[PDB]
Each structure stands twice: as C-alpha cells, then as structure tokens.
Design a protein around this ligand. Sequence first.
Ligand SMILES: CO[C@H]1O[C@H](CO)[C@@H](O)[C@H](O)[C@@H]1O
Ligand SMILES: CO[C@H]1O[C@H](CO)[C@@H](O)[C@H](O)[C@@H]1O
Ligand SMILES: CO[C@H]1O[C@H](CO)[C@@H](O)[C@H](O)[C@@H]1O
Ligand SMILES: CO[C@H]1O[C@H](CO)[C@@H](O)[C@H](O)[C@@H]1O
Ligand SMILES: [Ca+2]
Ligand SMILES: [Ca+2]
Ligand SMILES: [Ca+2]
Ligand SMILES: [Ca+2]
Ligand SMILES: [Mn+2]
Ligand SMILES: [Mn+2]
Ligand SMILES: [Mn+2]
Ligand SMILES: [Mn+2]
Lengths: 236, 237, 237, 236
Amino acid sequence: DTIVAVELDTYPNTDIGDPSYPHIGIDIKSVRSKKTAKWNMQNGKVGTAHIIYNSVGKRLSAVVSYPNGDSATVSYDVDLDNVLPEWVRVGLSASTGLYKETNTILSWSFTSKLKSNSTHETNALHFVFNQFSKDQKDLILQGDATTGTDGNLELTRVSSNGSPQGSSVGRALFYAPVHIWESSAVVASFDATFTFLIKSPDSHPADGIAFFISNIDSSIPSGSTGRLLGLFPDAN
Amino acid sequence: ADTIVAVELDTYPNTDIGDPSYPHIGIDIKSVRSKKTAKWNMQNGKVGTAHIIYNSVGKRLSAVVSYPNGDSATVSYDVDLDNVLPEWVRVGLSASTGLYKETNTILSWSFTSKLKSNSTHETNALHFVFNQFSKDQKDLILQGDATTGTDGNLELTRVSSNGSPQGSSVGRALFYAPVHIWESSAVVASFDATFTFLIKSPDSHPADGIAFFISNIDSSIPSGSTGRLLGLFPDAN
Amino acid sequence: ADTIVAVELDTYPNTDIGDPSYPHIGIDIKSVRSKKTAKWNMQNGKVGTAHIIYNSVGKRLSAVVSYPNGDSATVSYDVDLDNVLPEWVRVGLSASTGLYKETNTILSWSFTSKLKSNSTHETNALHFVFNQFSKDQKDLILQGDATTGTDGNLELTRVSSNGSPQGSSVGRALFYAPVHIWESSAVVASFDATFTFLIKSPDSHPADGIAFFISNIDSSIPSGSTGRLLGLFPDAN
Amino acid sequence: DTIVAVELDTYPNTDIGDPSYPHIGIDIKSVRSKKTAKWNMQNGKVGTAHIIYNSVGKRLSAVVSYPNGDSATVSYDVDLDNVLPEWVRVGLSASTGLYKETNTILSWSFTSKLKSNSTHETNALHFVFNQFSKDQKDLILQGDATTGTDGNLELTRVSSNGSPQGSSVGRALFYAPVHIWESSAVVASFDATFTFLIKSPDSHPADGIAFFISNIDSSIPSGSTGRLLGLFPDAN
Ligand SMILES: CO[C@H]1O[C@H](CO)[C@@H](O)[C@H](O)[C@@H]1O
Ligand SMILES: CO[C@H]1O[C@H](CO)[C@@H](O)[C@H](O)[C@@H]1O
Ligand SMILES: CO[C@H]1O[C@H](CO)[C@@H](O)[C@H](O)[C@@H]1O
Ligand SMILES: CO[C@H]1O[C@H](CO)[C@@H](O)[C@H](O)[C@@H]1O
Ligand SMILES: [Ca+2]
Ligand SMILES: [Ca+2]
Ligand SMILES: [Ca+2]
Ligand SMILES: [Ca+2]
Ligand SMILES: [Mn+2]
Ligand SMILES: [Mn+2]
Ligand SMILES: [Mn+2]
Ligand SMILES: [Mn+2]
C-alpha cells in the first residue's frame, strides 16, 4: 500500500514518534507524521476537518476545528505526483485500541478538479454525503465500518447502547477510483471536508480518524488496530 | 429484467417499431418506443453536443442536441423518475449498429446529481466530468464492444484498425460508482448530463445511435439489443 | 414599471385580493395574484428552508418550502421565463409587514445560474452563497428597511432594539451584480436558489411574508408595496 | 490602490527589474515581480492561464500554457490576508506601449470558496464568461476595454481592420465585490482561469495581460500605460 493521510490523532504514542499530546498530522507513507500540530480533541462535540492541495503549489494543508472549542492547522510541502499513483481511492479510516471513542462521521465531501491547457476542466470528481444509509452502495466499507445507524457512518464498532469498543478498526472508501493526475491537466487540485463526532468513556480517547488517499486496491493492513489507525502495516 | 430510462440520439428510422420516418431524438421510458420524439439532423463527421436535465419537483425530463455547425432539436416529457427508477442506479452511455453502421465516438461526458434536504445542505451529491479517456479508464465499466481508444476518446461500438465502423455492434460505458438517485429526506432531486460525440460513417444511411441512460445498478447489454434496440432493450415492446 | 417573477412565502391570507384562506406558497408572474399556490405552515420561531428551481427547456418553475421540525409544501407552474423577463436581471429577497407583523430574518441564501451552449462549455454562469451577513455587506444592495444585523443575519423588515418586529415595513436585498438570464447562443438555461429564514412573531396572525424574486436590473421597492404586496408590486392587479 | 496580480509580461523592461525575456510573474504591490519564470509567448494562438491560492497553505501559484506551444509556472509564498483587504474586486488588465498586441480574452472564470468550521461552505462566489456581449452589465470596463466584438473582451483598443494600437490601457473588473476573507471561514480558497489570444505586428509584442485582485474602488492609475500594465502608478 501507498498511503497519504491527514490524521486526527487523539491518543499519543511517544514510542512511535507521536507528540505527547493529541495532535493532527500529515502522514506520507508512515505513521510517523512529517508534520504535526497540537490539537485539543473535544469529547461529545461536532468538529470539522478540511484538506486541500494543488499540483502547482505542491503543498498539502489541513485544518481541524471545533465551533465552541479548539482548532489546529498543519501544512507540508510535498509533491503527491511522486508519491501517489495516477489512480487512487479516497477514504476515511479510524481505529481504537485499549482506549476508544465513537468515530462517527456525520458528513464527508471530496472534490477533485483537473484544469487543462484549454478552456475546459479536463476531469473532475465530486461527492457529498450528509447522510448515510444502511446500504450505502457508493462506499466500500472495510473492517468494522457500518453505515445507517442514525444516518451516520460509524467507522469503528459501537455497541447497541451507544458505547464504543476497543480493538476495532474500519474504513470507508469511495466506490469509484479517482483519476488524481491525468495527462493534459495543467492544474490538479483537491479538497476534502468531513464533520465528525468523537464520544468516549476514556480520559485518553483513542485512537483517531484519518482522511486518506491510496492505491485503488488498498485494504486494512493486518494488525493496523490502535495507534496505526487502520492505515499502516507497521510503525516505520 | 433491466429498468431503463434514456435519451436516444436515433440516427436511423425504424418505422416498423414506431420510430418517426427521419432521424430523431427521443425520451425512452422503459421502452425503445419513445414517449416523445423530435426531428434531428445528425451531421456526419461533426462533433455534436447533448444536454439532459431533470428535477423531481418539476417531473419533466428534457434534452437538447446541437451541432455548432448545424441546428438544434429538443424533446421534453412529463415523467416522475422515482416512479420508474430504483433508489440506486448506474448512469451510462450506450450505442449500437446493425446492418447499417457509424462510429459512436465519445469526446466528453459529464453528469451532476444533487439532492437537497430540509436544510441548506445537500443530503447527497455526485458530479463527474470526462474530457478524455485513456486506455485503462478505471472509473468506467466498459461493456460489449466499447473501448477507450487512444485518440483520447471513448468508442462505444466496434471500429476496425483503418478507423471505419462495423455493423452488428453494441457497447456501453457505465460510471463506476452507483448513484443515489433517491434519498428519503431529500426534498429536491435534480440532475443534468452533457456529452459530446462524433458520429461518422461512410454510409448514406448511418445507424443506429447513442443514448444516455439510467439503469438498475447491475444492468448489462441485453441479448439482442443490437441495431434499433440501442443496447438498451431486449425487445421492441 | 418593474417586471417581477417571484416565489412568495405568504404568511397572511388576504382573501379579498385572491389569496387562499390560509398561509401558502405561490408563484407570482407579474402579479401578486399567484398563478399557483399550495397550503403552507409557517412555524413561528423555527428556521425554514426554501428551494427554487427552473430550466429553459422544461419551462416549469417549481419551489419547495420545508421545516426540519414540520412538513413541506410545493408549488409548480408552467411558464417560459424568457417570455417574461428581460435579458439582464437582478435577483433578490423581499419581505413586508402591514397591520400585522413578523421578523423576516435571512440566515442563508444561495443562487446558481448556468447557461449551456452548443458545446461542452458554459457560455455563462453565476453562483453565490451567503451563510452569514455582516454589517457592511458590499455584495448586496439593501433597499427600504432591510439591514444586515449582527446576529450574522439579514433582517428584511424593521426590527426594534428589543428584537420585536414592526408593522408597515418593507425591505429587500438584491445581489450586487446583474445576472445574464438569457444568452443568444445558450441552449440550456437553468437556475436554482435556496434560502433559510426565520419568521418570528408575537402575533397569532403574523404577516406578511418573504419572497425570492427576479426583476429588472433597476427594480426598487414600489410605493405602496407594504403588507400584502410583499415589496414587489405597486398594486393587486 | 492595493494590487496583487499574476502578469503575462510579453515585453521585457530590464530597467524596471524585469527579466530580459517575456515572462510570467507574481506581483505583490509592485510591478517588480516577487517571482518570475520564462515564458515563450506565441503570436496568434489561444493560451490559457490558471491562478490558485488557499489561506492555509498560503502559496499563490500560476500556470500559463499553449496547446501547441510553450508553458510556464510560478509560485510565491505570501499570505494574502495581510496584503489584501477583506473586500476586493477581481479583474483583468492589459496594456500596450510603443509596441502592441491584441489583448483578447476569450473566456474568464473565477471561483472563491469559503469553508467553515461546520459542515457548510460559508461563502462562495463563482462566475464564468465564455462569451461577451456589447452590453456586459456584470463587468466594469475601465479605460479602452470593450466587449462584444466577436463575442470577446478586448482589453486594449483594436482598430476596425483588426490591428492593435499602441499607448492603450484597459481592464474589466467583475461587477460584484468579492468577500475574499470572511469571519468564521476556516479555509478560504480561490482559483481563476482565462483563455486569451495575443496577435501582433511587432517582434517584441507588448506589453501584457494580467489577472489581478484589488481594493474594490480600484481604477486605472494615471500613466499606467505600457510596462506598468494598467496596474501600478509607478515602477517602485
Ligand atoms: C496499550 O495501548 C493500546 O491502546 C492504545 C490506545 O487505544 C493504542 O494506541 C495502542 O496501539 C494499543 O492498542
Ligand atoms: C435494416 O434493419 C437492420 O439495420 C438497422 C439499421 O442498422 C437496424 O436498426 C435493425 O435492427 C436491423 O439490424
Ligand atoms: C389587515 O390588512 C392589513 O394588514 C395585512 C396583514 O399585515 C396586510 O396584508 C394588508 O396589506 C393590510 O396592511
Ligand atoms: C519605449 O517603450 C515603450 O513601449 C514599451 C513596450 O510597448 C513599454 O514597455 C514602455 O513602457 C514604453 O511605453
Ligand atoms: Ca497516536
Ligand atoms: Ca431507430
Ligand atoms: Ca398575503
Ligand atoms: Ca514588461
Ligand atoms: Mn500521530
Ligand atoms: Mn427511435
Ligand atoms: Mn399570496
Ligand atoms: Mn515583469
């Protein structure tokens, strides 16, 4: 797997290079973020994350914020054209370990826009989910991810009473592959937004939610529970 | 059987199954026998453009086909697309040839679906645009004879090495991801589609046409859908 | 005189000028006397949402009004908007009070205009979204009593210091830039609009309503357009 | 005036800091670009320019390309939130001096998208012109700019026969002011595209076309003909 992700790291794993507080981070082929920023996760409130990148500027940026709480931002110079293949799948991942939290997605949108050296926009791909059904046929649900419960996407397993389980991992990839770079495109850009609700019975809720982009055939790596966020096969 | 709604660009008049006696555009609602047609000039060798548009409040599906070097034809039909279509569909382009033939080349195709809720937000939306097609076009499901050739184009029907089209061919391209055409909380559901195309033939009676269509998610080319059936329908009912 | 097309959210029944005997929504084509209405429940103190939608091929203007804590009303009318409207227009929100009153508060407003040509491209497009309004809202033309208050909202009609609405008020907000509603090369012309709003009143008979409207570029509040005339019309013809 | 512009500098003025070849440049309050790149202008062919920026990454980027010719790119790190006022007008400018060229705009689009710390997009402004009429009521035409001739925007004066005049300057601003930064926006982004046709009877056609963003009340500065591009009152 080839993975680029923006993580909402709610649990600090200092032994695998995480900062010692909850943080947001940009991950380029490693759980050890290339850049992080402190982030004050807020139990039981709706937050929003935004991701943005264009192929000329070559800087991947993210922002996470609470209306009535904290906010954080992070940016990293990388060219995704040398990282990511031409065809990718876009997705959301989340996990728990010993500690947990609901990893509840209320909404998710993604917008890829490819402008050509002509008048026309060569390619484009845009979706919005503000609600999720029990049979969400345009999402590939991996692991413990389920849709529909309360018109929501629950990436990690939640029991009937509404309490989260540990040792869970799950993801939701958009059904169609995304032509992230196409020939004849002069400018390739994308942005993403998701709104989420992290609830928990733990003092260090865990482990986080991530927006990712990967090879089309990406799947949950073996043992990627907990600190690995359902994203990486190891902590290198 | 498959459930089909489609706008047809019908190059060949099959009067014996209810086509008008000239090339036309039509709105097909579960039958190749159009509910509504309009006279249409297919300009051999020219790039044309079709636009489709509908909303769930108005319940009136409409299409326009134009050539930048010719004229325009339009057709509109009253129909409640949720009373025909299932909740989840796929969207596609189909085309066919029979005893008479033509290239059914797609230069570009876009589709925009928006469902609006009780609030400001969209419960749901999908939009794609294609302005070229490569060899391995991973976001399209190609059926029958369709290929994504290297002129950067999508060829729906079989074209030989020299570039001349073959008879008795059928091909389609479905967008990869299912489309959520109905959402229970959705108050206003709309979509529009556009495709540019080049129909070229050495024939003075080119056949058979191209169609934008919406179908059940598992739709596939019916057996015996060549020629006048446009790769859409298993018969002329 | 001004040329007006508007969807009205009419909170007060003026039976004596052809309103139904209940609150309603209506499509007004050059006259306050709606061509089509539907029964409508205005939920005092609640945020509602209106959606408007039309295209030039279908020629059927449609609207939906919903409360997330109530129900929905819809109205549709066949009308060719180029046979009513000039080439260039402005788009706006209007509201009024008369002897009876209500707050006519706008929380959000969007408008999307797209005109499609002979080719893949849009000859022309305009889209705006407002999800809040400041004190100096430079992309809106405010008329009469309208203010862009500091609750981040647009107040169309006069509200006193304590927050209770006044009678005998009229206000409007027009988007700054003219809209090119007709283009000669344009084959498909569509638009959709959405606004969220809060009508609040201490009255058990609140009045008068809010309207999304389209008008000549130089339109202004007609004299005597308070109350049942919704800031739109100079009389009840 | 406060001016941020991306220029398509077809004529080199080495005495005011231009490179010694035609170039594209990013201008931040000065005709002396903060960054330039060589650009092989191509007489009598349709080209396309793209501009892009977001307020998190804080990098303004541009690309100019010909289908059957040359292409160029330039990027500059700047925060436009400390440069540009909250309200702006967006526009196109072009000029001639002793030397000229048709400064013909075939199409122009702009897209401002403001995402909030909620689900919603706080504000947005998007327009597309692929054709231009003799009474283009949503453009403020300044100086010699005219619309309609051949469904086009001619920013600089062109005689009846179709040959360009020298000592001309003109611009077209979009009628509505643009709330480029609004409060409660978490991410502010914009992009712009214009396609153009530069034709000339000169070996060093002149002087260039620019996409700009300015204070709402911006107007052609006195003597901004020629090398100043209708943008700046002087060459500082
Ligand atoms: C003992 O730690 C476990 O739980 C934490 C937090 O849940 C994870 O980060 C880690 O990988 C383990 O699964
Ligand atoms: C003459 O009839 C045949 O050819 C026409 C035109 O190709 C088809 O429509 C039809 O199905 C038959 O195959
Ligand atoms: C009772 O009539 C008055 O009040 C109603 C409701 O406000 C208005 O519609 C009308 O124009 C008059 O001013
Ligand atoms: C003599 O130079 C003149 O013409 C060139 C190119 O047209 C301009 O750059 C310059 O400002 C002058 O107007
Ligand atoms: Ca961690
Ligand atoms: Ca036929
Ligand atoms: Ca009334
Ligand atoms: Ca110069
Ligand atoms: Mn981390
Ligand atoms: Mn037919
Ligand atoms: Mn009424
Ligand atoms: Mn320069």
